[PDB]
Design a protein around this ligand. Structure first.
Ligand SMILES: Cc1cc2nc3c(=O)[nH]c(=O)nc-3n(C[C@H](O)[C@H](O)[C@H](O)COP(=O)(O)O)c2cc1C
Ligand code: SF4
Ligand code: SF4
Ligand code: SF4
Ligand code: FES
Ligand code: FES
Ligand SMILES: [Zn+2]
Lengths: 87, 263, 210, 80, 83, 22, 106, 426, 47
């Protein structure tokens, strides 16, 4: 069984709240996986605004885009799920 | 009225008085690992692979056979109810002959999967296994009965769904073999259903002995034309020739069974 | 547990309850509730064995008919319990108790004595078919630990020699004083009654009013 | 007897030619949409996929096992 | 011809494939090669065929040689054993 | 000393006493 | 060793092949034994992963040592049961030595 | 404490010494207040049972009163029934063989006294088929009683009508089980049922039924005669009355004597029966309730009152109260090993945990006696043991696990040495 | 191979062959499965 540190699930969780608070107009859901990974979910209109805040905020600098992908859930009305992973 | 409220892991499902513990889990959506319990066959309790843990109770209860009672919480995934499955699966497998690459119920086994999902990863049975002489029960069902987990669903179907009342248990101990005492073929319509109803691959179909393996079979749902009951059936086709026709459930017409002719 | 039809043991051997036996069968059925004749399987099957020790497949079939029960049912009962022979059995059919209580009081010796006394190994029968030796389990009568059940009788509290004596009695003559061939009466304290020494009580004694 | 594969709705395209291959006897198919079976969680969503993609659809209602009353006592009934 | 009686009919054209070429077949056929091996006369009701070589063989299985008439045959090797 | 049919025959004798069936 | 082909057509070598290369169809042989009527490894499809070597319970299908089997025509590369069984007979001595050396590791 | 008086004993005919037939029984005055008692009614009788505090007397000692009471509910148009199990299979039990053979009548009036308590239409006595001679004795006794009119219509002057029958057992220990006795009575294979349809609710032939150890049925008429108090006084607290004790194996005078329940064990063998063969020091272990109960070594044998409460404190069961004693001259590993052999030759095989589990322990136990098995295997059997203990449909799997648990619990060093002994000679 | 010879198993070849690809001994792939859908042959007897 993998070793899990809850330090991260707490740090990341808090940040999630911070982002959400700062960008409430677009953040719909903000979850941390059991794998200690945060996944803010934003309304499509918040693409520009949420990214920019993360690229240029002193308390959250997310300079490089690791990846942009689109899972396709055919059942979901909005078929694609554009996912942007940042570092 | 007539609606007790029982909690399956605190979900407050409500069930008619009379529902078994296994049935209570079903409406929430949980599925008790089960052998020897078939919906349209009488409850027998032979396997005891369904032991669950009602809350605040000393012993675990038999799901398929315990009338639910008001208030009970099922604790289906409780550490205990997992030892009660990690330790039963230890036993079913202990006397089992590992010829899974012979057993044509390879991917159609409710005993490997219930073992891969609800059981342990290893074995401790360093002792020897048993072997039971096979039987020529008929020209349709191949009974490689060294596979049998003595779950008595055949003896039920062969008595309750079909009125054959021939198959029976013979002896006691670890050499209880569920085969006809004298070698009299199981000749009746509704005969082939035993194949579909034995979760083990002890007795399986002799024509479809080794022509395929289930993951490959593409399954198209169609209608029985041999007889006028119009029983629903699933035609399993591989690379374009039909390999098997097995029943698919229609409550009103064929409820999980099909004739010896149409399979 | 499989009856592979054999010329000797197969239905060609016709079976039918002697007229008298059928009378007995009727009474047996009467005990059970009407509409529940099937319950008389065990008793009737036994009667068949009484008639023929072999209890051949034919017998099992007769039982079924007599009780109007599925043939398989008779088979299940016969193959489940152990007092049913399901094969030919020795005239005497001695059975030696070898559960821990008896063994702790040296049951093994008795078995060994019998094996050579009989000249036949356990699980086997003498050539004359007079004696069949079986290692049966607790037959009750544990108190008289060393014990064996010859046919229906219970010879108990036997020292190795005693059996040889009994077997001889069986081999020449009959009815060899069946019972505990020892000084003790039944299951009393061997040396002397530890209780029940005094006379028994009387009617009404220490009775609460009504 | 497991029911975990009778949960989600699936829409499957109609089956087409599967002629034998002359050189090796392998099955050969000319229909591209054959092996494709899309899985949709609800009947409404699957119907939507057919309409916007323009494929014809013929939905079959889910048929779930009806409740069945069972009780171990019955098997020991005085008169069944 | 082949193990399974695979013989192109006198009119089939895949026979053109074999024109000017060898149709690959093996003289050593299993159905026959197993027959040669004699029935093993074991003296125990149930014996096990590990497949020969243990881990280098086939999954271990126990065979019931109780049937006096017939002989047990390992679903794997095909080896036969009789009591 | 008792015969193989003691139990059964004795019982039959008791049949007369046996109370009426259900 | 007796001469009975090891494969018993469980067909999981087909299940785990990543490329869909192995095609197996089987039927009970006259002896009554389980055997494969057709076993076709398409070597051009095969990517030589070696999982089939891994998966087989009787270890009937093995990755043989020879790497030099370049062929003039594409059809020769497709292999039926007779070519593979013949390949097995030719290289059995070395295959047995190779499996002998590495089985403890597996 | 102990030291029951012969006068206050219940089966004076124990050890025979008095005609087991009716005459001797009349001098015993066993049929003295039977008409009156039944005239009292079902309730009063059941009440006396509760006051008695009489526990099972058979295998698990359930309160008798409450149990019988479960069928004192109004008839639903199905005849209620009485079943008196006399299988007496638990290894070490000759306890019941006495009442049946020596004092058949006591049980006959036990049956009708008990019958009106449950309002049973009739009682069937399942004496093990092994005991053919025993059967000969009881129906001779039953025949006498009706001839007298004590049983049958107009039972003993009572409008109550009760008929008593004897059923042939066929050499099965499991037949003894409460749900399985019924099925044998029903004529099917002797396979226990699940408890959810309880025995009273679904009876034999679907008619409410109740099952009692023959000792339990036998004492009910005398307890009503002597009153619950007299009886309840002899025992300790919950554990009450005097239970017959059968001591067999490694004791100077093995015998069945009835003594005040709650009688110290060191004393039982010391006062009645006879001294532990070879001196009390020669006591490796004793199994107080028969094969099913775990054996206790000499740690407690010194001071353990044989009452069910005291034994459960000790982790062992009073059970049939069959004392089997093992001197230091016995291979316990083999002693318990044959009891597991006793259970593989006997469990019905209906349930997966007992079928394979008991066979699995038998195979491991045989290796343990040889010493072939390694030391780590010993704690595995423990784990195999509890898998069987809580998962079985009936109690026999409960019973098979306990002796295994006892051997590991107190004799773990000895088994390790047998482990060691074989490893050394290679 | 001289020092420790190989195991002989009474099926293994004694004459091993090189690439037979350009030579007429070459594998020509063929389906080894028998016919699947047998057909109704007409009746040869004129009705
Ligand atoms: C395997 C097994 C064997 C049993 N054998 C006997 C027996 O020989 N005699 C007996 O009185 N009870 C036996 N019992 C207990 C009965 O099932 C039942 O609990 C008991 O007879 C109830 O009687 P009581 O109410 O007088 O205790 C056995 C139980 C089991 C699980
Ligand atoms: S049944 Fe056939 S498949 Fe399922 S486990 Fe036993 S052998 Fe393997
Ligand atoms: S055959 Fe199939 S169904 Fe009949 S018992 Fe054995 S396993 Fe259960
Ligand atoms: S090759 Fe190995 S795996 Fe593939 S089928 Fe033959 S045996 Fe099963
Ligand atoms: S399903 Fe619960 S007993 Fe077999
Ligand atoms: S053990 Fe032999 S008498 Fe009970
Ligand atoms: Zn083999």
């Amino acid at each position: 069984v993998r070793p899990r540190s809850d330090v991260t699930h707490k740090q990341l969780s808090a940040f999630g709240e911070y982002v959400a608070e700062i960008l409430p107009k677009y953040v719909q859901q903000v979850q941390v996986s059991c794998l200690d990974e945060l996944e803010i979910c934003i309304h499509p209109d918040g693409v520009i605004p949420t990214l920019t805040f993360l690229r240029d905020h002193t308390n959250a600098q997310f300079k490089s885009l690791a990846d942009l992908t689109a899972v396709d859930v055919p059942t979901r009305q909005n078929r694609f799920e554009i996912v942007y992973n940042l570092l | 009225s007539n609606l007790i409220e029982v909690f399956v892991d605190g979900q407050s499902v409500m069930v008619e008085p009379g529902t078994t513990v296994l049935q209570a889990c079903e409406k929430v959506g949980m599925q008790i690992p089960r052998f020897c319990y078939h919906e349209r066959l009488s409850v027998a309790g032979n396997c005891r692979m369904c032991l669950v843990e009602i809350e605040k109770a000393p012993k675990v209860v038999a799901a398929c056979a315990m009338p639910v009672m008001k208030g009970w919480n099922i604790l289906t995934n409780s550490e205990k109810s997992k030892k009660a499955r990690e330790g039963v699966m230890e036993f079913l497998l202990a006397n089992h002959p590992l010829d899974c690459p012979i057993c044509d119920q390879g991917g159609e086994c409710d005993l490997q999967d219930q073992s891969m999902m609800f059981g342990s990863d290893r074995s401790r049975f360093l002792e020897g296994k048993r072997a039971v002489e096979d039987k020529n029960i008929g020209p349709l069902v191949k009974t490689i009965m060294t596979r049998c987990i003595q779950c008595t669903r055949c003896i039920r179907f062969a008595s309750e769904i079909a009125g054959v009342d021939d198959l029976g248990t013979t002896g006691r101990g670890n050499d209880m073999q569920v085969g006809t005492y004298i070698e009299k073929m199981f000749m009746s319509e509704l005969s082939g259903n035993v194949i579909d109803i034995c979760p083990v691959g002890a007795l399986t179909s002799k024509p479809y002995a080794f022509t395929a393996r289930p993951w490959e079979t593409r399954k198209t749902e169609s209608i029985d034309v041999m007889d006028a009951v119009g029983s629903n059936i699933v035609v399993s086709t591989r690379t374009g020739e039909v390999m098997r026709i097995l029943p698919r459930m229609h409550e009103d017409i064929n409820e999980e069974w099909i004739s010896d002719k149409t399979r | 547990f499989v009856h592979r039809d054999t010329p000797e043991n197969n239905p060609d051997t016709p079976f039918d309850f002697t007229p008298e036996n059928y009378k007995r069968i009727e009474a047996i059925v009467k005990n059970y509730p009407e509409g529940h004749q099937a319950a008389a399987v065990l008793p009737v099957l036994d009667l068949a064995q009484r008639q023929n020790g072999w209890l051949p497949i034919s017998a099992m079939n007769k039982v079924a008919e007599v009780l109007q029960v599925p043939p398989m049912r008779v088979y299940e009962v016969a193959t489940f319990y152990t007092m049913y022979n399901r094969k030919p059995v020795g005239k005497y059919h001695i059975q030696v108790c070898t559960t821990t209580p008896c063994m702790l009081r040296d049951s093994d010796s008795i078995l060994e004595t019998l094996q050579r006394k009989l000249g036949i190994k356990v699980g086997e029968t003498t050539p004359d078919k007079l004696f069949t030796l079986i290692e049966v389990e607790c037959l009750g009568a544990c108190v008289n630990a060393p014990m064996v059940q010859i046919n229906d009788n219970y010879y108990e509290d036997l020292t190795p020699k005693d059996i040889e004596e009994i077997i001889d009695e069986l081999k020449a003559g009959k009815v060899p004083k069946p019972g505990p061939r020892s000084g003790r009466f039944c299951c009393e304290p061997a040396g002397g009654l530890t209780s029940l020494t005094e006379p028994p009580k009387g009617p009404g004694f220490g009775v609460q009013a009504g | 007897s497991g029911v975990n594969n009778t949960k989600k709705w699936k829409m499957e395209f109609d089956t087409r030619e599967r002629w034998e291959n002359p050189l090796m006897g392998w099955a050969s198919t000319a229909d591209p949409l054959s092996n494709m079976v899309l899985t949709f969680s609800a009947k409404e969503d699957a119907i939507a996929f057919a309409e916007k993609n323009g494929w014809s659809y013929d939905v079959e209602e889910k048929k779930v096992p009806k409740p069945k009353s069972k009780s171990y006592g019955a098997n020991f009934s005085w008169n069944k | 011809i082949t193990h399974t009686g695979q013989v192109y009919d006198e009119k089939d054209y895949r026979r053109v494939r074999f024109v000017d070429r060898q149709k690959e077949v093996n003289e050593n056929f299993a159905i026959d090669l197993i027959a040669q091996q004699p029935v093993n006369e074991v003296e125990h009701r149930i014996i096990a065929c590990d497949g020969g070589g243990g881990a280098l063989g086939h999954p271990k299985v126990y065979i019931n040689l109780d049937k006096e008439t017939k002989t047990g045959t390992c679903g794997y090797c095909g080896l036969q054993f009789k009591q | 000393d008792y015969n193989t049919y003691t139990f059964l025959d004795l019982n039959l004798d008791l049949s007369k006493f046996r109370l009426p069936q259900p | 060793p007796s001469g009975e082909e090891r494969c018993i057509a469980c067909k999981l070598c087909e299940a785990i092949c990543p490329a869909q290369a192995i095609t197996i169809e089987a039927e009970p042989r006259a002896d009554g034994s389980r055997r494969t009527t057709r076993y076709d490894i398409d070597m051009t499809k095969c990517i030589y992963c070696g999982f089939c070597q891994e998966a087989c319970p009787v270890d009937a299908i093995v990755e043989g040592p020879n790497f030099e089997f370049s062929t003039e025509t594409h059809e020769e590369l497709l292999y039926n049961k007779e070519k593979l069984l013949n390949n097995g007979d030719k290289w059995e001595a070395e295959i047995a030595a190779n499996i002998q050396a590495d089985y403890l590791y597996r | 404490f102990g030291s029951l008086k012969d006068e206050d004993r219940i089966f004076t005919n124990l050890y025979g010494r008095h005609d087991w037939r009716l005459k001797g029984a009349l001098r015993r005055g066993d049929w003295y207040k039977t008409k009156e008692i039944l005239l009292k009614g079902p309730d009063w009788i059941l009440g006396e049972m509760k006051t008695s505090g009489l526990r099972g007397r058979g295998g698990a000692g359930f309160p008798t009163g409450l149990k019988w009471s479960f069928m004192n509910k109004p008839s639903d148009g199905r005849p209620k029934y009485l079943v008196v199990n006399a299988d007496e299979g638990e290894p070490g039990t000759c306890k019941d063989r006495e009442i049946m053979r020596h004092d058949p009548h006591k049980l006959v009036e036990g049956c009708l006294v008990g019958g009106r308590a449950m309002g049973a239409r009739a009682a069937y006595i399942y004496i093990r088929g092994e005991f053919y001679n025993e059967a000969s004795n009881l129906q001779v006794a039953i025949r006498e009683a009706y001839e007298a009119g004590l049983i049958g219509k107009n039972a003993c002057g009572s409008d109550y009508d009760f008929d008593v029958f004897v059923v042939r057992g066929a050499g099965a220990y499991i037949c003894g089980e409460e749900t399985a006795l019924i099925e044998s009575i029903e004529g099917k294979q002797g396979k226990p049922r699940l408890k959810p349809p309880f025995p009273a609710d679904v009876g034999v032939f679907g008619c409410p039924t109740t099952v009692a150890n023959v000792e339990t049925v036998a004492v009910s008429p005398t307890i009503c005669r002597r009153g619950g108090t007299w009886f309840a006084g002899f025992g300790r607290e919950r554990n009450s009355g005097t239970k017959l004790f059968n001591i067999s194996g490694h004791v100077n005078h093995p015998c069945t004597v009835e003594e005040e329940m709650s009688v110290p064990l060191k004393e039982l063998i010391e006062k009645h029966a006879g001294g532990v063969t070879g001196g009390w020091d020669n006591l490796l272990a004793v199994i107080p309730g028969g094969s099913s109960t775990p054996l206790i070594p000499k740690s407690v044998c010194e001071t353990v009152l044989m009452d069910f409460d005291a034994l459960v404190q000790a982790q062992t069961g009073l059970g049939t109260a069959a004392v089997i004693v093992m001197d230091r001259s016995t291979d316990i590993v083999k002693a318990i090993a044959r009891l597991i052999e006793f259970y593989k030759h006997e469990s019905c095989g209906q349930c997966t945990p007992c079928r394979e589990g008991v066979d699995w322990m038998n195979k491991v136990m045989a290796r343990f006696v040889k010493g072939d098995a390694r030391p780590a295997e010993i704690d595995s059997l423990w784990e195999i043991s509890k898998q069987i203990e809580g998962h079985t449909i009936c109690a026999l799997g409960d019973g098979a696990a306990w002796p295994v648990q006892g051997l590991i619990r107190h004799f773990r060093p000895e088994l390790e040495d047998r482990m060691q002994r074989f490893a050394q000679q290679h | 191979p001289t020092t420790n010879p190989p195991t002989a198993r009474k099926f293994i070849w004694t004459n091993h062959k090189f690439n037979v690809s350009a030579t007429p001994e070459q594998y020509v792939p063929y389906s080894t499965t028998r016919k699947k859908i047998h057909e109704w042959v007409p009746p040869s007897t004129p009705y």
